[PDB]
A = this chain, B = another copy of it.
Amino acid sequence: ALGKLQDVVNHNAQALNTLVKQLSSKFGAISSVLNDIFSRLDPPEAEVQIDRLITGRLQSLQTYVTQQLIRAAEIRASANLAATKMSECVLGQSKRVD
C-alpha cells in the first residue's frame, strides 16, 4: 500500500532519466557532438551550429527546473498536513470527525 512514497521516487528518477536522455537531441544540427562540429567546420557557421544546441539544452534545463519547482509545492502541502496531523493526533485527542 506504500504507493504514495513510491510515486515520488519514480517521478524523480523518470525526470532525471529524461533530462539525461535529452542530450541525444539534434535540435536541427547536423550532429550531436560538439567536437565533430568543431573539427569539421570553420567557426563562421560553427557559431550558429552550436548556438542551436545551446538553445535546445537551455530550454530543457528550464523545463526541468520548472517541473521541480511545481512538485516542491505539493510536497510542502503534504508535509504541512503531516505536521498538523502529528500535532493534533499524537499529542492529544481530536474531536474532529474522520
Name A's B-contacting residues (CB within 8 A). 28, 51-52, 55, 62-63, 66, 69-70, 73-74, 76-77, 87-88, 91-92, 94-98
Not counting A55-B55, A66-B66, A92-B97, a sample of 12 additional A-B residue pairs whose C-beta atoms are within 8 angstroms of each other reads A28-B51, A51-B52, A62-B63, A66-B70, A69-B70, A70-B70, A73-B73, A73-B74, A77-B77, A88-B96, A88-B98, A91-B98
Main secondary structure of the interface of A (DSSP, over half): helix
A and B contact pairs by CB, cutoff 8 A, 24 listed:
A28-B51, A51-B52, A55-B55, A62-B63, A66-B66, A66-B70, A69-B70, A70-B70, A70-B73, A73-B73, A73-B74, A74-B76, A77-B77, A87-B97, A87-B98, A88-B96, A88-B97, A88-B98, A91-B97, A91-B98, A92-B97, A94-B96, A94-B97, A95-B95
